């Protein structure tokens, strides 16, 4: 999409409601960046459900900001690890809590109060 909001890029990178193979799912991401990303975590939940985490209590992020929010329960995920543009990955299923950073929406985002913009942590 030539240009993207932070939240839209978050969705592209990290929202995968139905699992895909890592090699296929990473192809689009690696095309936008022109490199084989070495690792990526895909969350198997909808954008709407991940965005609801932003309404939960705010907590500190790795970068020392306080716009992070922890999921109330674990979710299923796929961890893709690089093993260009012929990038090949290994995959691991995971079931973990996550922490997202959230910001107010940009003009081009859905008009929630807050939207998820970064995957801060898995735990």
UniProtKB/Swiss-Prot annotation:
Record's function text: Ribonuclease which shows a preference for the pyrimidines uridine and cytosine. Has potent antibacterial activity against a range of Gram-positive and Gram-negative bacteria, including P.aeruginosa, A.baumanii, M.luteus, S.aureus, E.faecalis, E.faecium, S.saprophyticus and E.coli. Causes loss of bacterial membrane integrity, and also promotes agglutination of Gram-negative bacteria. Probably contributes to urinary tract sterility. Bactericidal activity is independent of RNase activity.
Subunit structure comment from the entry: Interacts (via N-terminus) with bacterial lipopolysaccharide (LPS).
Inducing stimuli: Up-regulated in CD14+ monocytes in response to the uropathogenic E.coli strain CFT073.
Protein's name in the database: Ribonuclease K6
Site positions (Facilitates cleavage of polynucleotide substrates): 35
Site (Important for bactericidal activity, bacterial agglutination activity and binding to bacterial lipopolysaccharide (LPS)): 12
Residues where substrate binds: 37-41, 62, 81
Lineage: superkingdom: Eukaryota
Biological process terms in GO annotation: antibacterial humoral response; antimicrobial humoral immune response mediated by antimicrobial peptide; defense response; defense response to Gram-negative bacterium; defense response to Gram-positive bacterium; defense response to virus; innate immune response; RNA catabolic process
Residues of the full protein shown: 26 to 150 of 150
Cysteine disulfide partners in this protein: 22-80, 36-87, 54-102, 61-68
Record keywords, A-Z: Antibiotic, Antimicrobial, Disulfide bond, Endonuclease, Glycoprotein, Hydrolase, Lysosome, Nuclease, Secreted, Signal
Annotated compartments: Secreted; Lysosome; Cytoplasmic granule
Keyword ATP-binding belongs to the record: no
Species lineage: Eukaryota, Metazoa, Chordata, Craniata, Vertebrata
Stated family: Belongs to the pancreatic ribonuclease family.
Consequence when changing residue 35 to R: No significant effect on activity towards dinucleotides UpA and CpA. Reduced activity towards polymeric substrates poly(U) and poly(U):poly(A). Significantly reduced activity towards poly(U) and poly(U):poly(A)
Species this chain originates from: Homo sapiens (Human)
Glycan-modified residues: 31, 76
EC number of the protein: 3.1.27.-
Tissue spec: Highly expressed in spleen (at protein level). Has little or no expression in healthy kidneys (at protein level). Detected in interstitial leukocytes in infected kidneys (at protein level). Expressed in ureter where it localizes to urothelial and submucosal leukocytes (at protein level). Strong expression in lung and thymus, and lower expression in heart, placenta, pancreas, liver, brain and skeletal muscle. Also expressed in monocytes and neutrophils.
